[PDB]
Structure 1
């Protein structure tokens, strides 16, 4: 098959090259460029088949259907990568502003490690002991702090006190002025050798400027987390479309091997 080895083989190769675009990180600035070349290569080989196809009036050759399916996968791949830029900015005038989908996306992003589907939800250790039970710590519906861990749960309790123990220690523990744990024990006359405890009020003003500089850097780290939160929502879309297009790509290959004996 001269036409089956120079025109059908590139059809699956072009679609297969688009699958790599769905396995790349959302932070890649050159990802959109790669997807453009895939669509460009399809048009180069599409013109050759146009001349072969007879110029009829209402009889559309079945070869055009195969190219349409391939173009949709390649065309949608570029659009999918373009949508990634919206998440990185989410501008009020344009982007993924509606939050009704962000909550759903966040749950899907956290399902990558433990998918709710039977593929991973059921294929995992299971027992009737306390390892799979529930308690007050696990159920945070009543404003219960999550179990401390190294994944970021400790930081949410300490750093993100939210007018809590970190900022305002409402519980009267009696440690600041009732214990010698690096603090005076109700010692109201603890002077700095006859001078006020603070050697210079100017130091407090310097701390405000220094703290603001440190606070601005802290916001930069938090800004990256916000960008990372949108980054995760951008990679799942590529992964979600990778599986959806995988079935379509397989179907197209099957159709070619199944329709050739009847037409070709």
Structure 2
């Protein structure tokens, strides 16, 4: 049961950050939150990763399950923040007023990461739903 409970508590923050990010992606205010959340999610990943990596070590039994998934994630997550920045440079038009003012690319990058998380959690869940040894 700990497998489900643990992952759950880990999904809270995972999806949380992604959500808060969308709020900025679609609403590029460029007031400071861009760089603020940038390092936030970056530092939040490295930390959370250490925990997931601690439970799944590799010294006597080399067989990473969730780790292999958590790693590939940081990869797409890293280059992602890079593109967002460059985009902000090119487009120097971020007026203030109300709401509504995003871009297609930003939306696509979000929709992709969205399903990526859903298929991820289920990936390891279906790969080994049992609580047996390995």
Question: TM range, normalised to the smaller chain?
Answer: 0.5 to 0.7
1:263 counterpart residue number: 131
Q: Which runs of 5+ in 1 are unaligned?
A: 96-236
Please tell me the root mean square deviation across aligned C-alpha atoms, in Å: 5.9
Distance 1:248 1:21 in 2: 20
Offset at residue 61 of structure 1 (A): 0.9
Distance 1:15 1:263 in 2: 29
Checking the alignment, whether the CA contact within 8 Å between 1:22 and 1:238 is kept in structure 2 is: yes
Question: Higher relative contact order by CA 8 Å / sep ≥ 6: 1 or 2?
Answer: 2
Distance 1:23 1:91 in 2: 11
Question: Judging changes above 3 Å, is the alpha-carbon distance between structure 1 residues 18 and 57 closer, same or farther for their aligned structure 2 residues?
Answer: farther
Question: Judging changes above 3 Å, is the alpha-carbon distance between structure 1 residues 14 and 29 closer, same or farther for their aligned structure 2 residues?
Answer: closer
Distance 1:6 1:17 in 2: 17
Distance 1:10 1:81 in 2: 21
Offset at residue 261 of structure 1 (A): 0.6
Offset at residue 31 of structure 1 (A): 1.2
Question: Judging changes above 3 Å, is the alpha-carbon distance between structure 1 residues 27 and 248 closer, same or farther for their aligned structure 2 residues?
Answer: same
Distance 2:5 2:70 in 1: 18
Checking the alignment, whether the CA contact within 8 Å between 2:26 and 2:106 is kept in structure 1 is: yes
Question: TM-score, structure 1 length as denominator?
Answer: 0.36
Given the alignment, which residue of 33, 46, 50 partners 2:53?
A: 50
Distance 2:31 2:65 in 1: 38
Count the aligned residue pairs: 123
Offset at residue 51 of structure 1 (A): 2.6
Question: Judging changes above 3 Å, is the alpha-carbon distance between structure 1 residues 63 and 94 closer, same or farther for their aligned structure 2 residues?
Answer: farther
Question: TM-score, structure 2 length as denominator?
Answer: 0.63
Q: 1:175-221 deviations in whole A, cap 9, x for unaligned?
A: xxxxxxxxxxxxxxxxxxxxxxxxxxxxxxxxxxxxxxxxxxxxxxx
Return the index of the structure with the highest Cα Rg.
Answer: 1
Distance 1:88 1:24 in 2: 13
1:11 counterpart residue number: 14
Considering fraction of residues, name the structure with more helix.
2
